[PDB]
Predict the structure.
Amino acid sequence: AAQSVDQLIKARGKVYFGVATDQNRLTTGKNAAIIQADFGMVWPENSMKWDATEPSQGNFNFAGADYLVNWAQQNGKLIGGGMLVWHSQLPSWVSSITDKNTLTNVMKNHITTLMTRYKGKIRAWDVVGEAFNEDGSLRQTVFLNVIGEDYIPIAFQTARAADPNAKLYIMDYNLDSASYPKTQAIVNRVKQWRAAGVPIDGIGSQTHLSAGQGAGVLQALPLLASAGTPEVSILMLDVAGASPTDYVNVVNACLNVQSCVGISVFGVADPDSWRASTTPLLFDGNFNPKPAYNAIVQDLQQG
Amino acid sequence: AQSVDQLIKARGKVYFGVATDQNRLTTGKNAAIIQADFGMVWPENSMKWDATEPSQGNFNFAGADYLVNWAQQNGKLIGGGMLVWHSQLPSWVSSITDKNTLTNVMKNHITTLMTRYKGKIRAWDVVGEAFNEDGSLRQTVFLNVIGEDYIPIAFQTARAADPNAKLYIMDYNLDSASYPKTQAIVNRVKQWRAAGVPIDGIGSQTHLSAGQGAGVLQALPLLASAGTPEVSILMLDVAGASPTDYVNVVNACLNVQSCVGISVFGVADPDSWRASTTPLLFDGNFNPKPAYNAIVQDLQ
Ligand SMILES: O=[N+]([O-])c1ccc2[nH]nnc2c1
Ligand SMILES: O=[N+]([O-])c1ccc2[nH]nnc2c1
């Protein structure tokens, strides 16, 4: 009884506990069974990234994304998408563009095409990811360099037009400490963009922790919430060593922040992690729930 | 771990290979183990029809391109497939009822895939899983609509597109010499080749339950009696992964002159299509399992 973290988190008033996946996870291991039972939202591990979806200008690849969207619909799961504008996994045809009008239109087309395809089916998009340097200045990607800092407002405005139903998020990593310049900076810039009417509905904190860093998220998450977005989230969570303590502290940070809609982990089982040697996830290599999973369950159960 | 690929090459074979794809290469320890221990890679999913031509004339090559490029960069041989198969088949194909229309759809798919990687692919599986367990031909959309001759056409079309690729009809349940399916594919391939159909190979999609490794020692020589220049063991996995089934498996290949190699159907057990049986050669912690160490000792 009372072993789904998603079901338990919803009972506490949150939207979901989610997980990244894709077609070949769904067809292998025990991923599909675990997601069916335990998780309420799925995100494309890779199939919606720019290198996967638009490998040459205007030529899109949607087989993988479609597979995930369909599976999520068939299994009654919410679906997230992203990242629409991101410097990593970004084809060389984009990064070679030097003309402002041409990159603006290429960016807008990428956004619009993905969001239109899935219009009305996607809870939330990560519209812009990893836009910040560690010092809090904006990262000098092709977007910044060629379009300028208006590429962020343009990306969100384009997204809202493409699918007004989706929650639109900015996401970044190393927003885990409240004193860190990057944390402070994304709040200040998101406040300013929202004051200019940019439709930033959420800040997503891509939470990749080392052992003992869970505690600090209890202060960093409320600070992100202070930017005034309707939502914030913990995304792509993983924790080197998968201490119960670190995991429960992240969880509780979300519970404590009224605008935090949920938490997503960056895969199901350790061996399928990008950092497997750190065993950073909630299920082991035999697909058994780990102590951290059980400690989340106890944390979320109610009297 | 000592490399089963290098050891099998030392025994005169071409390769010991493995199925993989982009997201395996960027997670777990898969890239490192493939680099060290395997000499050929196959696309787990990225060259299947559903992945590559999800609507008519709309091709998706990013995933396949990634694999091909990784293989080149790391000095690995590459295989492709499956070009004609009833599983992971878009409904736009299976809904076709006209003979010419489907013949042309089948040809265009084959040609477009094989032409993009021309010269890079050691071997294609042109046809897979074409047989019923009783040895008759599986009543797929291609047999129902185009007829028997779909198999000859598929092989023929494959040769024109890349004359340097080894062409392999493939099937499963070819694991026992006494099984009707095994004798059946041998007879048909003999006749197709007599008529000049360019079938260079038969591959044995070898999905075994416990204890079935022993029978491969007679089934593979029977497959090789069809007279193809090559045969292979493909997509190998064995429920329970005991050393007996797999060594016994390593040795069927070694005993059959025309067998070019063996490929396993993934690296580590949790990434198997069947994982609770812990049936591959590396465990959920990416350790080499007793069956990997037994293969190494057998090949030394
Ligand atoms: O929470 N996630 O693990 C996760 C994974 C991939 C994504 N792409 N866009 N948002 C994403 C979220
Ligand atoms: O040996 N293989 O594991 C393997 C995997 C996928 C394939 N597709 N076509 N032939 C294939 C062989």
Summary: Chain A has 13 helices and eight strands.
